[PDB]
Amino acid sequence: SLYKGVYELQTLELNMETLNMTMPLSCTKNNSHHYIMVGNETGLELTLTNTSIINHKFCNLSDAHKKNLYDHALMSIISTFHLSIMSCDFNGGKISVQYNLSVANGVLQTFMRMAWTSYQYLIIQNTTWEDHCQFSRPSPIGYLGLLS
Amino acid sequence: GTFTWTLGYCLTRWMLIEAELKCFGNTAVAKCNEKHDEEFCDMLRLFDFNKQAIQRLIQLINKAVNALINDQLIMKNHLRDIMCIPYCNYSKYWYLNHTTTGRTSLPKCWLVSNGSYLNETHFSDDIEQQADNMITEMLQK
């Protein structure tokens, strides 16, 4: 099928994994999990669940930054997340963030903007890199849109 | 503001899926300096920026994001997603080839709706429009 008798339609696809060194890349495993990877050895997981991992409602940030034992990129991403729109735990270098959806409307709006709901919580945690992208290909557009 | 990064741009086998070497003319890529509603130029700018950043040196992209891309294009695509209009997943593009001479057209986004790519007949009109533009160009010179 050639258009106008001289032109033919052709297609191409783009690979965003060569951008792994500079831009964070996001992808959705399934409808309940989302993964944003920084570099090639560390990322961040966004989980919609009906389980509780932290009971207290405290959230301290000054002590976490003062200890200066964490990953700069991960803190930057969680900060640009929770200012664009909450139990917290960062002892031992961990990153555990709990959102008590069941405030919720804006958090889910940002979640849908990145990942572009009968779930009680939303948990943000730290993981290592694994081949997780199944439903969507990795692309930096979610974080680029969330930045501005 | 407006994007400021500047660029026969040629795409290597590490930037594509199931392709070896696809690349375009200077006339086609010259449009990337004077168009505001095209993704392909934004992706080209991101590619170029990553290339220079790695061969010359994440805060760099934090302070350099607005000099490369157009955020309102992302916002428009998000709005068309909310209101159930075909939008861009930001991966697939289509273009015309003209095998007899080799001159091509600047790639345009392949729309997505209901979790699947649109059929070629669902936007075929645009294709003829592009063909028309090309013929006028080859009738201009």
Partner: antibody
Framework: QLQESGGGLVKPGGSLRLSCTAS????????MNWVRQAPGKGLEWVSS????????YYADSLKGRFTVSRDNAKNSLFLQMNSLRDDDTAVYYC??????????????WGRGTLVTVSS | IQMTQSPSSLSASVGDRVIITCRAS??????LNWYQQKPGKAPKLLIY???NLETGVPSRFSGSGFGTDFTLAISNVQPEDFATYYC???????FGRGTKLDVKR
């Protein structure tokens, strides 16, 4: 380095276990796989396992007999075989896998251990 | 997907150019790794991504090809370059038959 152990002589139909310990890199972040070589023939891939043991891939013909796992705390990689057959004598290598150019490639191989099954 | 390797055992002396071919039924894009193994020793990479080169490997090894065809080329074979060569697809993680290289007489 990657040091492997557990090889030796085992009767047919028995249960066997091999171990591969690593020292010199981050054991937590790397996919690791097991490869096999028969005496006088080509190479053969036994299995592959990811970092947090979430994606485990197995040989098409070896499925149902081989069980792989790892201990990230002790930097160890264990393989268990049950209902061994006579043609399961071979040399076993534990290889470290790395992802680059959108592709898996093994960049470090161990010394390899010999397993013999006979009556 | 099954790979076919040619030839089974080719013969060439020092200084000559040698070519080995790994061919696939389907199109595996650019996903192929080339290994070399010495008798009684663990193998080592020569080629990754079917065209690139592993660090610490001499520059006389050239990998090329696309789609259903791939080729390894050695220009000037040194005495320490007689071993068994394997082509491994990096998605299904399957090896090839193997090609052996021997001296000429």
């Amino acid at each position: 380095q990657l040091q492997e152990s557990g090889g030796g002589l085992v009767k047919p139909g028995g249960s066997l276990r091999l171990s591969c310990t690593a020292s010199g890199f981050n054991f937590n972040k790397y996919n690791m796989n097991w490869v096999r070589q028969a005496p006088g023939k080509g190479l053969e891939w036994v299995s592959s396992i990811s970092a947090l043991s979430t994606y485990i891939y197995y040989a098409d013909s070896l499925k149902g007999r081989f069980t792989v796992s790892r201990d990230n705390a002790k930097n160890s990689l264990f393989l268990q075989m049950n209902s061994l057959r006579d043609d399961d004598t071979a040399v076993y290598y534990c290889a470290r896998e790395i992802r680059r150019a959108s592709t898996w490639s093994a960049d470090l191989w161990g010394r390899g251990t010999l397993v013999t099954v006979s009556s | 997907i099954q790979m076919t390797q040619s030839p089974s055992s080719l013969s060439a002396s020092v200084g000559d150019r040698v070519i080995i071919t790994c061919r696939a039924s389907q199109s595996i894009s650019s996903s192929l790794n080339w290994y070399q193994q010495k008798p009684g020793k663990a193998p080592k990479l020569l080629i990754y991504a079917a065209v690139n080169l592993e660090t610490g490997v001499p520059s006389r090894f050239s990998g090329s090809g696309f789609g259903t065809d791939f080729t390894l080329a050695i220009s000037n074979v040194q005495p320490e370059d007689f071993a068994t060569y394997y082509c491994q697809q990096s998605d299904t993680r399957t090896f090839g038959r193997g090609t052996k290289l021997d001296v000429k007489r």
